[PDB]
Amino acid sequence: DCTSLNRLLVKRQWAEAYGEGTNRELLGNRIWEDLFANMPDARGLFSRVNGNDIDSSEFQAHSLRVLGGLDMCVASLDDVPVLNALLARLNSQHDSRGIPAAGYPAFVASAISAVRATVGARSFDNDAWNSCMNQIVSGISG
Amino acid sequence: DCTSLNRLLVKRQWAEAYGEGTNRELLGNRIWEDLFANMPDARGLFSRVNGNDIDSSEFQAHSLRVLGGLDMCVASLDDVPVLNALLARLNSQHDSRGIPAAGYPAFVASAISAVRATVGARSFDNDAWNSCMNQIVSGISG
Amino acid sequence: DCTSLNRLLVKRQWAEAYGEGTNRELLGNRIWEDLFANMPDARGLFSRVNGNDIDSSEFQAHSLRVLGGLDMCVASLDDVPVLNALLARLNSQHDSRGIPAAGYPAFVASAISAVRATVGARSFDNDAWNSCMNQIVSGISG
Amino acid sequence: VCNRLEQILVKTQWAQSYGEAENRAAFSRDLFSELFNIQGSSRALFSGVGVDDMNSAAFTAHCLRVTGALNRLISQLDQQATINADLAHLAGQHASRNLDASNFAAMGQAVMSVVPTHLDCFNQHAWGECYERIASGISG
Amino acid sequence: VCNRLEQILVKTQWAQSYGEAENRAAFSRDLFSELFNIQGSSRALFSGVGVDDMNSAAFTAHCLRVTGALNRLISQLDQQATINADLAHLAGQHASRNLDASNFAAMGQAVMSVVPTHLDCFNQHAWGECYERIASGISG
Amino acid sequence: VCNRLEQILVKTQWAQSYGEAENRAAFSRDLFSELFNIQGSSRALFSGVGVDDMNSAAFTAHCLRVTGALNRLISQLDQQATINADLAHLAGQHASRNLDASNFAAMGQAVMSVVPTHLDCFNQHAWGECYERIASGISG
Amino acid sequence: ECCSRGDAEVVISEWDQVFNAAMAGSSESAIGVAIFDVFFTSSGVSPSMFPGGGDSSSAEFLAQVSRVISGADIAINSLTNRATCDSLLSHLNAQHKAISGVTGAAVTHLSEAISSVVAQVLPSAHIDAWGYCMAYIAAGIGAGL
Amino acid sequence: ECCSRGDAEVVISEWDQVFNAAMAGSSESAIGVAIFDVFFTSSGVSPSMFPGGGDSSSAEFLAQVSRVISGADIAINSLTNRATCDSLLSHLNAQHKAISGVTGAAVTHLSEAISSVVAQVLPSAHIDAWGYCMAYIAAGIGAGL
Amino acid sequence: SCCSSEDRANVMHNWDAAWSAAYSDRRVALAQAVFASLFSRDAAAQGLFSGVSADNPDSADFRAHCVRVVNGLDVAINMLNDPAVLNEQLAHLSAQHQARAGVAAAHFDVMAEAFAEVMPQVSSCFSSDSWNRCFARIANGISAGL
Amino acid sequence: SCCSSEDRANVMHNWDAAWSAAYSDRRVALAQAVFASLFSRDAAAQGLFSGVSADNPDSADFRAHCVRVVNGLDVAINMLNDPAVLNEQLAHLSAQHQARAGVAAAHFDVMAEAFAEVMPQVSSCFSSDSWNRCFARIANGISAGL
Amino acid sequence: SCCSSEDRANVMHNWDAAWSAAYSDRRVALAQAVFASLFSRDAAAQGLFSGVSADNPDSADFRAHCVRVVNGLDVAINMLNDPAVLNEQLAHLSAQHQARAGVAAAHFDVMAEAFAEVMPQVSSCFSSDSWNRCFARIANGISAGL
Numbered sequence A, B, C: 001d002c003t004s005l006n007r008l009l010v011k012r013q014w015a016e017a018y019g020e021g022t023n024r025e026l027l028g029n030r031i032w033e034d035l036f037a038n039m040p041d042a043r044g045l046f047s048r049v050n051g052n053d054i055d056s057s058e059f060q061a062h063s064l065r066v067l068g069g070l071d072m073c074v075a076s077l078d079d080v081p082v083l084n085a086l087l088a089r090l091n092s093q094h095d096s097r098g099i100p101a102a103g104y105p106a107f108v109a110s111a112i113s114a115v116r117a118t119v120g121a122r123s124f125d126n127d128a129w130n131s132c133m134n135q136i137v138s139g140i141s142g
Numbered sequence D, E, F: 001v002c003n004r005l006e007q008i009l010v011k012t013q014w015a016q017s018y019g020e021a022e023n024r025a026a027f028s029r030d031l032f033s034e035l036f037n038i039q040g041s042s043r044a045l046f047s048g049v050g051v052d053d054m055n056s057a058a059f060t061a062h063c064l065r066v067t068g069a070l071n072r073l074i075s076q077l078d079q080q081a082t083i084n085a086d087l088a089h090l091a092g093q094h095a096s097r098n099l100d101a102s103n104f105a106a107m108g109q110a111v112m113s114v115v116p117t118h119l120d121c122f123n124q125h126a127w128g129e130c131y132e133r134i135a136s137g138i139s140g
Numbered sequence G, H: 001e002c003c004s005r006g007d008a009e010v011v012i013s014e015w016d017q018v019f020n021a022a023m024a025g026s027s028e029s030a031i032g033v034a035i036f037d038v039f040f041t042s043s044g045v046s047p048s049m050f051p052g053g054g055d056s057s058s059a060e061f062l063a064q065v066s067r068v069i070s071g072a073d074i075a076i077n078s079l080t081n082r083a084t085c086d087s088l089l090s091h092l093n094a095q096h097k098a099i100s101g102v103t104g105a106a107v108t109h110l111s112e113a114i115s116s117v118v119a120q121v122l123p124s125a126h127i128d129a130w131g132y133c134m135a136y137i138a139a140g141i142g143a144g145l
Numbered sequence I, J, K: 001s002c003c004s005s006e007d008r009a010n011v012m013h014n015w016d017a018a019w020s021a022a023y024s025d026r027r028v029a030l031a032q033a034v035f036a037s038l039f040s041r042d043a044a045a046q047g048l049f050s051g052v053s054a055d056n057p058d059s060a061d062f063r064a065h066c067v068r069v070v071n072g073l074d075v076a077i078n079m080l081n082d083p084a085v086l087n088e089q090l091a092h093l094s095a096q097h098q099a100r101a102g103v104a105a106a107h108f109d110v111m112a113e114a115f116a117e118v119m120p121q122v123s124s125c126f127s128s129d130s131w132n133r134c135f136a137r138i139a140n141g142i143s144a145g146l
């Protein structure tokens, strides 16, 4: 789905959970700590950016690059032509990197769970987030 | 066990963790999030009440019905004759529903853990809670 | 490693997370709850101190004895001759107790994770903590 | 006039200055008070909406309709086709009210008077361009 | 332009907005910040007074001299013969600075931007007339 | 004199009394004000560092160097070999300044005067022993 | 009372969070279009009654949508002053009496379409307070219709 | 400005948390030695230029280390009063002009060694504020060198 | 009538102050008086509760039915700050009462009177006006369809 | 010049107030104006962006490049409260721009002018002094090496 | 005597201010002085510590014993806000000292004197009255049985 109303809700709640400054590292840490616990083999994919120490400066820069890419796509959710071009470029940066296809549903689950933990679970629209997050990762994976 | 003094302590701490209004949803979310993580097959039992999206309005109503039933039994802990009649009726609503016998110890563990997380772990009487919670679920299960 | 600068950082952050009074029980509970979840067989090692109920007075005294022993070693990190003598005595209290060799890396992971959760993850020096904690447990285990 | 960058600036400062709830009413009353203080001849044009008492419900309601229209126009400043159609609708409604250019120049100066007194930052250049964009669409 | 009634209104609102002591410095820095934000090409004209750092003593001193001149002119708004002579003196000083009409229009919009943000009441009509009175005396 | 237990007490009370940032400057000025109030003949010894105005940057800088040296000595009170070498360095610097025993006794009483006024607890016994330890290392 | 001060305050706060001039016009059009889509199906009112004919890509219709929600926006933000709000609703009532085809049932459908769309973009919305206050707005606009 | 009041305040607070008289002298020596170790390798300055000859077990060198960081400690804590700090740096500048071998580059190396060691014992340090304020301290001490 | 924000805040606080599980020997007393009042105002309603031993009020069976029914109101009252969930719950309660032969919407008007009679006697600080409107908002959601 | 604590606090707040993902149809407008200004001041720079359809500015391809580049500044601006991570990011960005033939350090001086021209037009409350110093602190970290 | 709420709050704060692991070269100094004082007041007590090299006080072996013993007091002092756990700990400590031949209850009266002599010299702000009563509450729990 990801209706026009869903995109406004996701954009608002993403900006809130993503936030400004170091608050972005708080959201990122929730995502990578959840992803690596549920999928321990994903950490090996980030050996070049010191995935063994997610608190290092090197991995935090990587983490904020990824969240910056997600923020980039979330902001363009209501601008589909630009979104497709953003996703096509993100696909080129991930293809043939050896990323398992299961990592993108797992990352989606971790990102949604981290946003839910930050903005509050009450009335949280899992359907809007899953459907809009799936539109993003389906343009990146493969 | 579940002595007369245990029942006063459980009633006091239950009311505190259960609380009023939307605070009851905070306790419920702790219970179902813990139960489904430790026993993933339990979520399928709640397909009719949208167990896949615990944040939906449909599942929250179910969650508050269950916690209302537990609150009902906790309040009557010191009134054993009425408690037995309450438990007999709750047994009729669960029998032949296909509920695995392991779900009730697991629910007890999740309910106690959620109460403990809400009122504070220091001096928490696990013996009183386990023994009094076991009297309740043993009247429901089977 | 565990350089002279690492020992000052670990001492400062340990004292902060360890704290005073009942705050020490907050740190201990984080350690044992994490250790027993990741290594369920470790709980059986503490049957004499009521490991089944970590909230009991008996286990809390044990928990604070252990954290007191760790605090003892952390405080002496920059006094290597005394540290070695402290570790030799701690080894005598654990040898032939049937403690699996995997329990000490697991305890280190739980202790570091609990300190990290208490002082904050941002800029947390996992390398200093792992290297200095490893010097301590390597003197105790075996 | 009123480029895409200026539109964002004006939309931000208007929403913050206009406010919410009763603040919109006091803001709207202040706007027409400044209009009357700048051009006394404009007050009589509103004799049909209880201008005799500017705190009355009837005149407060008229002030909110005008500032609410200003609110809906600024909201659509970045949708050129939508705001042009809306301004054309407003131009049709105002054509029979015997208004001249000085009436709209006075209203603009009233806007330039009240809006910045509810702000810490105000770009009168962007507001001049973008108000002119709106007023010219209504005046004819 | 700028009648005796408007002069009193502008003198009152200027003195209150301009303030005293360090508030004059922050006000004067804000004025030139808005000028540069409105017309970026005007910043280079002040390269001789430390505009590279707008919090420096050298540039803060220049901003106070300009607003202080604005202060002395508004103070003499009601003495036509005195302010005309003073504006003629200022016009002589600015004639060699390679300034155009848009420079003074941008400064005016900067004044219309910063002055009302330090006030609860602001009459942009009177300020428009009386600023134009002052600026035309300097621009030539 | 100044045993390991007393050193910890003095280190704790000094760090708390000396404070941080500008509090160190006011503390250091107060110390030399009490010195001059106790021994008026000691003021002239500092004529080379702007003692004519005790709020000047030059004299405030001198007061911080002296209290900063007191700070570095107390910091090393528990490293006997390190502080002995540092005191010997200071004794070499003070040997040509024509100072006597009463100069250092007055400075001590000044320390005993200012330090406790920034504390809730003060052990003058430990401070007497440990100051004497420091001063004797410098006086010769 | 129906639409108490407390009800009005939370309705206004949630509405202005979802609808204000700082947002993009495309976003406000997307909300208004969704409101009209819901209104069309619950009321059965013909879209040809409106300029642009209900076509979301017609600038004439998006302006008509902007005018209608703006009228609701003005009424909502005036909810804490009943005297002013009554006058605003009375003016809207007179305007719609001169419009052939406007019934009190349809005005209720449109007011309820506002509340339901708000709860979709803001699922934490106080939908009881929204129901009471939009019913109060609907009764004033469609009085006698 | 370079080393603003806000920069100075956070630098002072982080410095005094890491370096104060309540700490053990061995700890302050360990920090100062690490600072000098970093300075020796980045500046190439011979340790024989200092009393004790850079030997961390020589009491003469640990006292020399104590004097140098104390001079930096006094300058750091005076960062919120530029007039006082300028005078402190001017006095340090005159002292080092009379010392053969002290260059402005080496003074910068030592000031940067302070910031890097602080960030090792306090990884949450505001290293940009540390860079700006220690550069300001370095320019005053090594003026003309 | 409308159950306003101030109404439900008042009603939820005073109800929970009386019904909380922290207290003992209150729920049975309150719930019994409610049904005693209901039967006093509608003698025909007692026949609808023949499966819960309505003719023996002090039996554990009837006491448990009273507590069970009234606790259902507690669940609904504490949902007044999340009406989206309340609407789901009231729809659930409506389907359960439609499957019970003889339960009519006018019976809830008698149930409202029973609570309107019992609550003032038991709740220190009681606002009947706020209670009547917020009980109606819950009862009207259940009694819809029958 | 130094990007002080007060500078980055001001810059981060005003930037995020304009660039936040909570708003729509702002990022493209801002990012397009930045590159429109860059090409207006350095006509040779457009050739470095031939792979992103620089000659068709309203294409989704070029719009996405503008948003992608400017969002990289948003990532770096929001790192100003963690300069240890910023330094890691600026080193990462430098290696990416060294592998691009023709990108010189003087181009960032033109990019600074483009932002210095666009931001005052778009950001209510804008401090050019704070912006110029904190943009320089980020741009100097990227343009090092080329 | 009773170790009151105000007593243990005062004692726990002043003790932790001296014994915290955040500081260096304090624990050994304090712990050594305590045992130096104990041996000065009871020359026979030194024989009970022959397994920890009591005749070589500056050895790492004896220093570690001093720190180990005194840190046991730190553990007990910081339990004063949870006396249920303190009672479990003091019972644990009592069984360990009963298994040590020659340890008598009068020795703890000498140990109290050693702390009463050392602490005033080391702790800025020291309340001997509060210390004497709260040390007694801990020491009496250990020395019970011997």
Ligand code: HEM
Binding pocket: A042, A045, A046, A048, A049, A062, A065, A066, A067, A068, A069, A070, A073, A090, A093, A094, A097, A099, A100, A103, A104, A107, A136, A137, A140
């Ligand atoms: C919406 C989802 C995602 C977005 C927006 C995203 C975006 C990004 C971005 C912007 C980078 C920076 C590339 C660079 O600068 O070199 C990156 C790097 C990377 N990402 Fe993704 N990513 C997503 C999901 C994932 C997932 C699910 C995985 C693996 C399970 C993954 C694995 C990686 C890896 C391995 C790198 C390379 C890190 C390095 O060595 O520098 N990404 N990603």
Ligand code: HEM
Binding pocket: B042, B045, B046, B048, B049, B062, B065, B066, B067, B068, B069, B070, B073, B090, B093, B094, B097, B099, B100, B103, B104, B107, B136, B137, B140
């Ligand atoms: C003290 C423990 C429990 C209490 C008090 C309790 C109470 C309740 C109550 C009051 C309902 C509402 C029934 C209705 O209105 O139709 C319910 C429904 C239900 N409960 Fe339980 N329950 C407990 C434990 C469990 C456990 C452990 C499970 C499964 C592992 C379970 C599974 C269910 C299911 C499947 C439903 C039906 C939901 C639906 O489809 O509407 N319950 N329970």
Ligand code: HEM
Binding pocket: C042, C045, C046, C048, C049, C062, C065, C066, C067, C068, C069, C070, C073, C090, C093, C094, C097, C099, C100, C103, C104, C107, C136, C137, C140
């Ligand atoms: C730095 C790491 C550790 C330190 C400092 C430490 C210290 C201590 C201390 C001081 C005691 C009290 C002994 C007594 O009073 O009788 C103790 C007891 C004990 N510890 Fe450790 N310990 C550490 C790690 C571990 C680990 C990793 C395990 C098991 C996986 C373990 C298992 C035990 C057991 C079984 C006891 C005996 C409890 C009883 O029955 O009284 N310890 N420890």
Ligand code: HEM
Binding pocket: D042, D045, D046, D047, D048, D049, D065, D066, D067, D069, D070, D090, D094, D097, D099, D103, D104, D107, D135, D138
């Ligand atoms: C510049 C932006 C303006 C906007 C957005 C605007 C908008 C509006 C609106 C929405 C109404 C309500 C019509 C209705 O619902 O019946 C109205 C009425 C009116 N406006 Fe304007 N207007 C503007 C300028 C002006 C000016 C400058 C004047 C006169 C100086 C003026 C005079 C009137 C009059 C006389 C009425 C009708 C009063 C009555 O109903 O008795 N308008 N305008």
Ligand code: HEM
Binding pocket: E042, E045, E046, E047, E048, E049, E065, E066, E067, E069, E070, E090, E094, E097, E099, E103, E104, E107, E135, E138
């Ligand atoms: C509108 C009212 C204005 C007033 C009252 C005013 C007044 C002054 C005054 C008092 C000085 C100080 C001259 C001195 O003491 O050396 C000055 C200098 C200057 N003003 Fe103006 N001025 C005005 C408008 C402008 C405008 C609009 C511009 C350019 C856009 C401008 C550009 C300059 C320049 C370039 C200088 C000399 C800078 C230098 O010394 O390097 N002035 N003005």
Ligand code: HEM
Binding pocket: F042, F045, F046, F047, F048, F049, F065, F066, F067, F069, F070, F090, F094, F097, F099, F103, F104, F107, F135, F138
């Ligand atoms: C008791 C602890 C003392 C300490 C730690 C101390 C330390 C210092 C220090 C660090 C300097 C700076 C030298 C330089 O950098 O050029 C200094 C200078 C000086 N001190 Fe002391 N001092 C102490 C006692 C005294 C006393 C008691 C007197 C006189 C009553 C005194 C008189 C002077 C003088 C005259 C100077 C040089 C002033 C000048 O440079 O013109 N000092 N001292």
Ligand code: HEM
Binding pocket: G045, G049, G050, G051, G067, G068, G069, G070, G071, G072, G092, G095, G096, G099, G101, G102, G103, G106, G107, G108, G110, G111, G137, G138, G141
């Ligand atoms: C909450 C409900 C409603 C509100 C707040 C509202 C408000 C408004 C407003 C402000 C206008 C613009 C008046 C102007 O041009 O000055 C308008 C026009 C119009 N309304 Fe309504 N309205 C509502 C419901 C309805 C309904 C239910 C219908 C039809 C069934 C309707 C039919 C129309 C039509 C056809 C126009 C255009 C008239 C024209 O173009 O001259 N409205 N409405």
Ligand code: HEM
Binding pocket: H045, H049, H050, H051, H067, H068, H069, H070, H071, H072, H092, H095, H096, H099, H101, H102, H103, H106, H107, H108, H110, H111, H137, H138, H141
């Ligand atoms: C932030 C940088 C520096 C600070 C704060 C500093 C400060 C000091 C201080 C306070 C003293 C003691 C003066 C006294 O005895 O009264 C000193 C001495 C000395 N400094 Fe520096 N210094 C710095 C950098 C350097 C550098 C880079 C060098 C060499 C390349 C150097 C060489 C020396 C030497 C050799 C002495 C001993 C002179 C003697 O024993 O007479 N310093 N410094």
Ligand code: HEM
Binding pocket: B089, I045, I048, I049, I051, I052, I065, I068, I069, I070, I071, I072, I073, I076, I093, I097, I100, I103, I104, I107, I108, I111, I138, I139, I142
């Ligand atoms: C706010 C008002 C009411 C609420 C919240 C409510 C709720 C409930 C609940 C929770 C049950 C338990 C269902 C079960 O355990 O299976 C129940 C049963 C029942 N209710 Fe209602 N009820 C209300 C009013 C009424 C009224 C007014 C009547 C009829 C006059 C009624 C008739 C019944 C009957 C006949 C049963 C079946 C009892 C049995 O046979 O076990 N209810 N109700």
Ligand code: HEM
Binding pocket: A089, J045, J048, J049, J051, J052, J065, J068, J069, J070, J071, J072, J073, J076, J093, J097, J100, J103, J104, J107, J108, J111, J138, J139, J142
């Ligand atoms: C603060 C200033 C700048 C930042 C933050 C920045 C950041 C970025 C980012 C994030 C990308 C996307 C990389 C990718 O998707 O593979 C990029 C690409 C690029 N940038 Fe920069 N950039 C800046 C300034 C400049 C300047 C001044 C130039 C040249 C005049 C330049 C030349 C390029 C080029 C040629 C590309 C490749 C675009 C393509 O072919 O896809 N950048 N930059």
Ligand code: HEM
Binding pocket: C089, K045, K048, K049, K051, K052, K065, K068, K069, K070, K071, K072, K073, K076, K093, K097, K100, K103, K104, K107, K108, K111, K138, K139, K142
């Ligand atoms: C508050 C007072 C005291 C506390 C908290 C305390 C605590 C401790 C602790 C923690 C140990 C280490 C046990 C081990 O590592 O196996 C110990 C050992 C010992 N304690 Fe105590 N103690 C106290 C007073 C005394 C006194 C007064 C005496 C005798 C005069 C004493 C005699 C001993 C002996 C002989 C050992 C054995 C040391 C060895 O051989 O390793 N204790 N005590």
